[PDB]
Design a protein around this ligand. Structure first.
Ligand code: MYA
Ligand code: CWZ
Ligand code: MG
Length: 411
């Protein structure tokens, strides 16, 4: 049923998954020197391309390919519209490897036809807590703890084949070539997410959304006026009253994050992310890059009291194209990013997130039920959305875990 994924070092079924007890590689250990020097063979009308992410035109080419051809909802009503500034941020973290951004162009005119991006991530991905308990009970502790150390691996995102080239098996060829380029750098594992079901996820979570401007959301058919609001004399006034928020944060102490905060935010974030089975480890440079405010892209606020940062939250912006509405061109969405709470209940900290997002003109706040995102869904009036985000590894056996044991946010 999978002419491509059946050939790859991933668990092939849920049964295989269910019998995985330790973290570790799937494949033959291999070396750099084993790997073909030369790009994978490709049709004489296409050519491989490595975009220069410090070239504005290169970024623009990737931007237009994703604007017109990237992920849509199931009813083709919305399509993500990652900005150019966002793409430069996401694609170029500290020590990114340029060669890991892989494109296919049509030779004759250098039209970008497909793209995939890899970036470095340092990931904790050793045997999960519940399986370590089972390993104690079997006398198998050392084997379970073998791959406990964070690993420098590849995080894959932005896979996209132009709509005119769909279903010609181009995606596999892009994935093989990305894989070659990563392996040539002595990296052998990757982490990626998808909303489609592939062999075989290690975790799956629902999406959630929190309405900020319900009048717009209804107008674009992101949201409906729900049936129960009809027994009401006036639906929309009631919907707006339901989702109203204060004008200003409620936490005294809350301000935008500045560069001097990097050390304290690193410390509180890393302490927090330890409570999860799979999670990123960030250097001060990585914290600076991913969390310092960037206009239009990422927004981060800390709670500081008595000159100490105690809590913080972050969200990033991705607008979506609204396919064919005469009043609105764009859905202006905020996505919950990393956070850490030490002084206040997480629901009180995230409420300030919603208040800030709302004041700054966002229409909705979205998220996946990773991290402790469930502890605030009901109080903060998040609703479950359609479908699920699945998490996967390339070349890594991993027991199934709950998405509340997953601490990697994927942009
Ligand atoms: C160590 C380093 C390793 C690094 C690499 C690690 C692996 C990274 C893997 C990528 C992680 C991506 C993470 C994200 O970015 S998820 C976002 C994916 N992007 C979109 O959904 C944007 C809109 N759609 C498209 O652009 C195209 O439909 C894509 C490009 C998705 C497929 O193109 P097309 O529709 O024209 O199909 P094909 O004929 O060329 O290819 C058919 C094969 O492709 C398999 N397929 C379909 N969708 C996905 C998918 N999302 N992940 C992996 N595989 C996928 C499919 O099961 C089939 O193989 P098999 O079932 O026959 O076996
Ligand atoms: C699927 C696979 N890989 C990447 C993506 C694109 C980025 N989506 C990641 C993401 C992270 C966290 C939450 C959500 C999310 C939450 C609630 C509802 C939704 C649903 N979407 C809303 C807007 C939109 N624009 C184009 S399709 C679409 C539908 C997403 C979405 C999606
Ligand atoms: Mg194709």
């Amino acid at each position: 049923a999978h002419a491509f994924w059946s050939t790859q070092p991933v668990p092939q079924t849920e049964d295989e998954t269910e019998k995985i007890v330790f973290a570790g590689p799937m494949d033959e250990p291999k070396t750099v020197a084993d790997i073909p020097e030369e790009p994978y063979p490709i049709a004489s009308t296409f050519e491989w391309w490595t975009p220069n992410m410090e070239a504005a035109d290169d970024i623009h080419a990737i931007y237009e390919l994703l604007r017109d051809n990237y992920v849509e909802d199931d009813d083709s009503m919305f399509r993500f519209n990652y900005s150019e500034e966002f793409l430069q941020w996401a694609l170029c973290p500290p020590n990114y490897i340029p060669d890991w951004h892989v494109a296919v162009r049509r030779k004759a005119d250098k039209k970008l036809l497909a793209f995939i991006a890899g970036v470095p991530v340092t990931l904790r991905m050793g045997t999960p807590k519940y399986m370590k308990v089972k390993a104690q009970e079997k006398g198998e502790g050392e084997e379970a703890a073998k791959y406990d150390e964070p690993r420098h691996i590849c995080e894959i995102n932005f896979l996209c084949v132009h709509k005119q080239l769909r279903e010609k098996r181009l995606a596999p060829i892009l994935i093989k070539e990305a894989t070659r380029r990563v392996n040539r750098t002595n990296v052998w594992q990757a982490v990626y997410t998808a909303g489609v079901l592939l062999p075989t996820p290690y975790a799956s979570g629902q999406y959630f959304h929190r309405s900020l401007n319900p009048e717009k959301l209804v107008e674009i058919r992101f949201s409906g006026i729900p049936a129960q609001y009809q027994k009401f004399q006036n639906p929309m006034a009631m919907l707006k009253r339901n989702y109203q928020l204060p004008s200003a944060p409620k936490n005294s102490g809350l301000r935008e994050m500045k560069p001097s905060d990097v050390p304290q935010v690193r410390r509180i974030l890393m302490n927090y992310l330890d409570s999860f089975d799979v999670g990123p480890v960030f250097s001060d440079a990585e914290i600076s890059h991913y969390l310092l405010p960037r206009d239009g892209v990422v927004f981060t606020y800390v709670v500081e009291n008595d000159k100490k940062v105690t809590d913080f939250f972050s969200f990033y912006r991705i607008p979506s194209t609204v396919i064919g509405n005469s009043n609105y061109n764009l859905l202006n969405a905020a996505y919950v990013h990393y956070y850490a709470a030490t002084s206040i209940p997480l629901h009180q900290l995230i409420l300030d997130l919603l208040i800030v997002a709302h004041s700054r003109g966002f229409d909705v706040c979205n998220m996946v039920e990773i991290l402790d995102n469930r502890s605030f869904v009901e109080q903060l009036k998040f609703g479950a959305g359609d479908g699920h985000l699945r998490y996967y590894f390339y070349n890594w056996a991993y027991p199934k875990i709950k998405p509340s044991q997953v601490a990697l946010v994927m942009l």
